[PDB]
Amino acid sequence: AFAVDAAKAYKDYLASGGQPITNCVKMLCTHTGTGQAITVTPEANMDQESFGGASCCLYCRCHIDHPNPKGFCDLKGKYVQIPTTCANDPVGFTLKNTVCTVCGMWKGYGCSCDQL
Amino acid sequence: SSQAWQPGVAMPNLYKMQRMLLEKCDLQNYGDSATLPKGIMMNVAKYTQLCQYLNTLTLAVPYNMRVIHFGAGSDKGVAPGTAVLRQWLPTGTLLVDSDLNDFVSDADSTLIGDCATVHTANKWDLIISDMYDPKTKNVTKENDSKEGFFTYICGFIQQKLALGGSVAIKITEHSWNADLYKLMGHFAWWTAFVTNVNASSSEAFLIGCNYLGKPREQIDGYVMHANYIFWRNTNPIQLSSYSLFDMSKFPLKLRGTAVMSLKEGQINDMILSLLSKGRLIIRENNRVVISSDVLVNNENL
Numbered sequence A: 001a002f003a004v005d006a007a008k009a010y011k012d013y014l015a016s017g018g019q020p021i022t023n024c025v026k027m028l029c030t031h032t033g034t035g036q037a038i039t040v041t042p043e044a045n046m047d048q049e050s051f052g053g054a055s056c057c058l059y060c061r062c063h064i065d066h067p068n069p070k071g072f073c074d075l076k077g078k079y080v081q082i083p084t085t086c087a088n089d090p091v092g093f094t095l096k097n098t099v100c101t102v103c104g105m106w107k108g109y110g111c112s113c114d115q116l
Numbered sequence B: 001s002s003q004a005w006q007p008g009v010a011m012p013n014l015y016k017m018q019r020m021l022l023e024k025c026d027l028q029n030y031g032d033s034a035t036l037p038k039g040i041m042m043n044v045a046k047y048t049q050l051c052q053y054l055n056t057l058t059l060a061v062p063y064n065m066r067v068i069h070f071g072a073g074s075d076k077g078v079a080p081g082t083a084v085l086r087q088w089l090p091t092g093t094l095l096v097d098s099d100l101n102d103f104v105s106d107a108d109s110t111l112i113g114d115c116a117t118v119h120t121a122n123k124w125d126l127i128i129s130d131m132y133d134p135k136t137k138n139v140t141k142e143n144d145s146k147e148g149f150f151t152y153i154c155g156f157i158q159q160k161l162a163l164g165g166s167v168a169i170k171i172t173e174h175s176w177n178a179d180l181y182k183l184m185g186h187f188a189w190w191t192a193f194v195t196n197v198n199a200s201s202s203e204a205f206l207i208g209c210n211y212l213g214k215p216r217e218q219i220d221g222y223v224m225h226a227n228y229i230f231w232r233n234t235n236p237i238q239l240s241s242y243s244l245f246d247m248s249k250f251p252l253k254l255r256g257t258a259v260m261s262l263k264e265g266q267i268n269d270m271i272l273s274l275l276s277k278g279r280l281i282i283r284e285n286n287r288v289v290i291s292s293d294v295l296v297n298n299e300n301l
């Protein structure tokens, strides 16, 4: 019943004081885009940076299987928007946070479905 | 003057017409560096200015465009240029990349190994190459036309570039090839493009625009590289990152360029005119299939 848990390992390494994964590929963009979390072209808004998706995927970057049973990557070949305040560790951010299935924003960093 | 606000500088036509001899390249701003926007890699900037420059040419841009990108791995194991190409190309553009060493990419398919191990039966609408071996930087031995990957690249163009397709091939003072310059005259137009962010380098991208399958003009590639170095040596380019801040017109305009399947007989002057104007691509539109040759060996004794 053994599989390696890469997500936990990274989370624990960050808590031990480890340096975040680097060389996530930051894109040049207008920073007037939609703000959505994962998109086919950079969509950073004023408070976000856009990155090449593969370079922000723990599984891509560590040469290990994706958690999906099909192994499909939700980041590869797309662009992820990271809050500028969290751009020092994009891989950390994508790992820890979850995209709203409804509006397409990061839960807690854009999604307001839960209002009114 | 205004060059600083461009993405870069193309070799002016009068320099192409010269017959200079090859000199060592001596750039006055060698060593100087452009001021990149906060946190932006040199290679993202460089590919961005290249794509900005390509937006000014007559690129064919069909539906279900096919682009292949050689030398796309970096020393950090990711593919910055590929990320820029994919941002630039229309959504859904088939994008394949390759490099000698393993790397993580946003390309639809990635092939690792020497470029000569790469085979496809499909034609391509756009070939991009950043292949470069830095050992070919020795200033203590003659600067001869180089082979290796450039020989593969010349063959890949003649064999696998659709008519009306375009190319951008990275060269430097010592990383260059005479036949590739010659092949530039098999396009409707060509240039050597220096990005403003890397203007302190002898790097340029040899750009062939709208491939015609045949010589339109005759180019001696040894002479032309000498003309290129002559241009570089006498036209200092001011390092600039200015164009990187205005991304509003960056996306490649999806032209819906027409695709036809034709034989070598059916290529008349009307066709050639449309090829030359970026309004036609000639290739099949089958499914795209690539493969990587694998050497098989058993070392146990």
Ligand SMILES: CC(C)C[C@H](N)C(=O)N1C[C@@H](O)C[C@@](C)(O)[C@H](n2cnc3c2c(=O)n(C)c(=O)n3C)C1
Binding pocket: B025, B026, B027, B028, B029, B030, B031, B032, B139, B173, B200, B201, B202
């Ligand atoms: C300190 C800074 C880094 C450079 C500064 N400008 C300089 O001090 N130099 C000293 C000069 O006396 C020798 C010369 C002419 O070689 C240098 N140079 C100019 N262009 C070059 C080169 C070069 O060395 N190589 C390997 C190249 O490829 N190119 C294109 C310039």
Ligand SMILES: C[S@@+](CC[C@H](N)C(=O)[O-])C[C@H]1O[C@@H](n2cnc3c(N)ncnc32)[C@H](O)[C@@H]1O
Binding pocket: B043, B070, B071, B072, B073, B074, B075, B078, B079, B080, B081, B082, B098, B099, B100, B101, B113, B114, B115, B116, B130, B131, B132, B133, B148, B149
């Ligand atoms: C200037 S770098 C490419 C950087 C990359 N395009 C990026 O966006 O960061 C040089 C690349 O060309 C590749 N290269 C050199 N010779 C090659 C060959 N014969 N076949 C395949 N790749 C080669 C190297 O592996 C090397 O990573």
Ligand SMILES: [Cl-]
Binding pocket: A021, A061, A062
């Ligand atoms: Cl890593």
Ligand SMILES: [Zn+2]
Binding pocket: A054, A057, A058, A059, A060, A061, A066, A073, A074, A075, A076
């Ligand atoms: Zn992944």
Ligand SMILES: [Zn+2]
Binding pocket: A100, A101, A102, A103, A104, A105, A111, A112, A113, A114
């Ligand atoms: Zn929501």
